[PDB]
Design a protein around this ligand. Sequence first.
Ligand SMILES: O=C(Cc1cccc(Cl)c1)Nn1nnc2ccccc21
Ligand SMILES: O=C(Cc1cccc(Cl)c1)Nn1nnc2ccccc21
Lengths: 304, 304
Amino acid sequence: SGFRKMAFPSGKVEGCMVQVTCGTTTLNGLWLDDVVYCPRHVICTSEDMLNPNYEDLLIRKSNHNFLVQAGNVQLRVIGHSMQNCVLKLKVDTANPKTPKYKFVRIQPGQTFSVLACYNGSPSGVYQCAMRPNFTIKGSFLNGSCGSVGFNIDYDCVSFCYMHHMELPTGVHAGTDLEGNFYGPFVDRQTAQAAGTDTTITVNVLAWLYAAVINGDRWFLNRFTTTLNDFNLVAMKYNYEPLTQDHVDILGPLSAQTGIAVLDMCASLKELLQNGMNGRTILGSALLEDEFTPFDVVRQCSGVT
Amino acid sequence: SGFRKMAFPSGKVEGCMVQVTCGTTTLNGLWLDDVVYCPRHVICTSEDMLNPNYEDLLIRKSNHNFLVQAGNVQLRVIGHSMQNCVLKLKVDTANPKTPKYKFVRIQPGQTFSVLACYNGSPSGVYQCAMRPNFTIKGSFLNGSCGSVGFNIDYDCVSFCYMHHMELPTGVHAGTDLEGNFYGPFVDRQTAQAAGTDTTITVNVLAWLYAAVINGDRWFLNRFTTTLNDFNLVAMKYNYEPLTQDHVDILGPLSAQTGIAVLDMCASLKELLQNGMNGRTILGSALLEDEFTPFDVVRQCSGVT
Ligand SMILES: O=C(Cc1cccc(Cl)c1)Nn1nnc2ccccc21
Ligand SMILES: O=C(Cc1cccc(Cl)c1)Nn1nnc2ccccc21
């Protein structure tokens, strides 16, 4: 028993972290096979960041301007290209520590581990969710750009995020590994609106199921509800509408606890309308939404 | 900016995890140099667990009964000994992935990362604290015994915990790497009292400093207090007494924020006496105590 914000073991990803430098700028890169991936803003100076023409800036750069260092070894850059907001630096040596990997564009509401890095060196690992408004609430300092988010399935690392920027609002934004930003963000120093975020309803239900599995059952009531009645409450409290697809994803948790999804919804409705009354659920005094139903099943079944 | 429960990069420890089997029982072991460390209850059957005489049970076991497997390779056991509550299995092969390491007995209130494992395979990593009552609030399932807790300093892994058991109360208990239990716990299937836990005051103050560094300042008031007046409030709310040593450990955070420690205490006193009024601090609706002042400095400075 017990329920924590658990991240994936980071070893497979730590062996991929490199340092990329272009002139004055130093950030993290991801070395997979003979390609080093990093945010394209590595080629900018602070003056360029206000409104960069990346095609023009990249043209004034040659292979020898990109310093790629893997620990102590300097990698030789034999090619460079821009794919959307990432730079792809072809190097002459394949990473001997390249694990089985995939590049995936995660859906909003899904979770992933972040390996925060500085100067190509890992500092820490934490679990977070892609918010419905395509931002992430991570922990990043200057130098962290190029740190990646990933999931692990058996021995396959699915890279899903690369960190690009922190907006003046404190939100964190970045791209998939093909350089496409999640959300409406652009890699330029301009004020950017993130847009209204919502609570991931299916994730809060999954966490309520984790609470039931872990002995916290105070919030369980003698009531039930319908999807339409529940969604009226969800709309009022800026929660995502619960669909039959979400009910189906919750199936394993419903089967494990013997508590119908709509009965769990009724508990959530009373929790939204009355609050927690100063009580806690899994050590928290607020409804947690950064655990997917898969995260709960994995944590409560022991998937290695 | 941003503040998360960050764990250490786990790679160095993942390369040490092995599977130890003795008859029916399979748990995790830690392979460092030519020694595999694991909980001694690996030699027990369910009947033995009620009241085991470990010396007697270990006598009916020979080197060939301990099956140590590192991934796919079977390790050859050339020696066995019991050191307190751990079994030390001498093997004929030194772990080629042994990092620079130390065995340390952590103090209550300190934090460490846990790499949860099943069958010698890592599943996840999370940060937790050694509670003042020497229990940990982790996330463990059956098979997790032998999973370790550690801290990393530059390239040196300081192993501080090995998981042994979950008590009927849901608490998690274990030993340092010399087999000495943290707390009053014994490795036998008997009901055991954990004893009253307290909130780690110096950790809550460190987290209040993290909140100030990260823009959450609503809780800052026009008041100050003394150590004696604050400790009267701490005693009432089952908080550890704050000492001048704790004030000194908070020095870097006081210098970084320009907020005197006793001024931060006054905010904490009003927070304890009035609650949060439904508001949040760093995404939490309760006072967090599982971040040390060192954790805050590290997370807010980028120590890799
Ligand atoms: O924000 C930037 C640089 C930047 C500026 C303007 C546009 C772009 Cl694409 C990138 N770096 N980052 N990323 N996370 C950070 C956390 C703290 C301090 C700096 C941080
Ligand atoms: O508690 C035991 C076995 C045991 C029983 C009696 C005494 C001793 Cl020393 C050890 N294993 N563990 N450890 N964490 C667990 C979480 C869930 C299920 C089982 C778990």
